[PDB]
Design a protein around this ligand. Structure first.
Ligand SMILES: C[C@@H]1N[C@@H](c2nc3ccccc3[nH]2)[C@H](O)[C@@H]1O
Length: 438
């Protein structure tokens, strides 16, 4: 039904090695760094509560005046090796980096616009330095790219005339030029994560979205492309008019994750969630008292939740103007890293286990049929309920960290009580199950 020139291309999950790597990585970090870091949510004595990276919009700053922030771009504390070390110690396996946000300032020295790092006091190719430094630590790099661009007067939100259609065609060619540049200048890039593709102008030019995906896949072998890029012949986004996923993975969940009981459909495709530490700040905002700020355990909960349902999780950071990270973000990265060093066998290279969800936490499945119980909510009963699928039995339980044997008691036909450890681990913890299928 509904025939389409620009609808889905993959049927089912890609299983080539590059997609396996994307998937197995599981845990990433996001970097939102751009001129917005300089004002940090404040303009002319007013602190705006909205997302800092959107301050141009909240304070109604004309482009030319916003882009003059370039004269203040001088992050003297920037050190790409230090950033890569922070990422490595956090336990991230990849980093997604804002190459260009809506504002249109480029973190690489683009030859297609003057609004780049090259034309700042700092001069240096930030994106290039990061690529090298993260790659040297064995960390994959993914590129965020905003199609919407507030610095280019050829951009259009909608096509309402011939003059608009011509300006927008130029814009699309400009866009292609930047994308080709990114793909050829940084050939180790593993993914392009598009944003700012929701306007009517883009929805009417589905053909371009398909072309952008194909173009990049020809330039970068095995590259992944997110769903958000893609609009079909009819302007339907992410999933085409026949309900098929466009791009290589679904990129949708930001505020909330799929429901572990009601949204099991997501296990059928690759997907990646991205999350902020405050409620809704991606770029650096100077005042984190303005909204709820997640604790490390709340973030770890979300990371395991995503992997338990077959998805990746990416934790966002908004570096300071000076090129260092704020104390709250250093604390977060360090806490996550300490937990991942202990428990990361239940995260990396893991996936949906096919077990009925229980209240204590989440299951994940390893590559050799290990089933991990990740416990976030400790039962006063001191018993962790495990209901197995038809034909599956539990043969052993072990505490991950110490190897100590944990008692498993059959309670009914398809159900066990797995005891909690003899000593309360004092933090979310992992019990590994050995299971057998009839
Ligand atoms: C990953 C996130 N996507 C950007 C964005 N643009 C939006 C436009 C409308 C509503 C929400 C938006 N989030 C945010 O600035 C951030 O980059």
């Amino acid at each position: 039904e509904i025939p389409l020139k620009y609808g889905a291309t993959n049927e089912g999950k890609r299983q080539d090695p590059a997609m396996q790597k994307f998937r197995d990585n599981r845990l990433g970090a996001f970097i939102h760094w751009g001129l917005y870091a300089i004002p940090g949510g404040e303009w002319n004595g007013k602190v705006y509560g909205g997302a800092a990276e959107w301050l141009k919009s909240w304070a109604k700053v004309p482009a030319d005046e916003w882009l003059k922030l370039m004269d203040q771009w001088n992050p003297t504390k920037f050190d790409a090796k230090k950033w890569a070390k922070m990422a490595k110690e956090m336990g991230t396996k990849y980093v997604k980096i804002t190459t260009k946000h809506h504002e249109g300032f480029c973190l690489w020295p683009s030859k297609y616009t003057k609004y780049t790092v090259a034309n700042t006091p700092y001069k240096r190719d930030i994106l290039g330095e990061l690529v090298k430094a993260y790659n040297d630590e064995g960390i994959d790099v993914h590129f965020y790219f905003s199609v919407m661009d507030w610095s280019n007067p050829d951009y259009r939100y909608d096509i309402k005339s011939k003059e608009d259609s011509i300006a927008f065609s130029r814009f699309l060619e400009f866009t292609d030029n930047q994308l080709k540049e990114l793909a050829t200048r940084y050939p180790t890039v593993k993914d392009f994560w598009f944003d700012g593709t929701w306007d009517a102008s883009v929805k009417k030019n589905g053909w371009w979205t398909a072309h952008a995906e194909q173009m990049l896949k020809e330039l970068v072998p095995g590259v992944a492309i997110n769903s958000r890029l893609r609009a079909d012949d009819k302007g339907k986004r992410h999933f085409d008019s026949n309900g098929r996923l466009m791009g290589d993975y679904e990129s949708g969940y930001e505020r909330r994750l799929p429901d572990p009981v009601k949204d099991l459909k997501v296990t059928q495709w690759d997907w990646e969630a991205c999350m902020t530490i405050p409620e809704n700040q991606w770029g650096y905002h100077k005042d984190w008292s303005l909204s709820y700020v997640k604790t490390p355990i709340e973030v770890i909960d979300r990371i395991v939740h995503a992997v338990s349902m077959g998805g990746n999780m990416v934790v966002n950071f908004g570096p300071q103007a000076d090129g260092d990270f704020r104390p709250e973000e250093k604390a977060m990265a360090t806490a996550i890293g300490k937990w991942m060093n202990r428990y990361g066998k239940a995260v990396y290279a893991c996936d949906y286990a096919g077990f009925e969800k229980q209240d204590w936490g989440y299951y994940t499945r390893g590559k050799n049929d290990e089933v991990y119980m990740v416990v976030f909510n400790q039962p006063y009963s001191e018993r962790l309920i495990v209901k197995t699928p038809k034909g599956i039995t539990v043969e052993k339980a072990t505490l991950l960290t110490t190897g100590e044997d944990i008692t498993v008691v059959e309670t009914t036909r398809n159900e066990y009580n797995v005891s909690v450890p003899k000593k309360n681990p004092g933090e979310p913890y992992v019990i590994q199950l050995k299971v057998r299928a009839a």
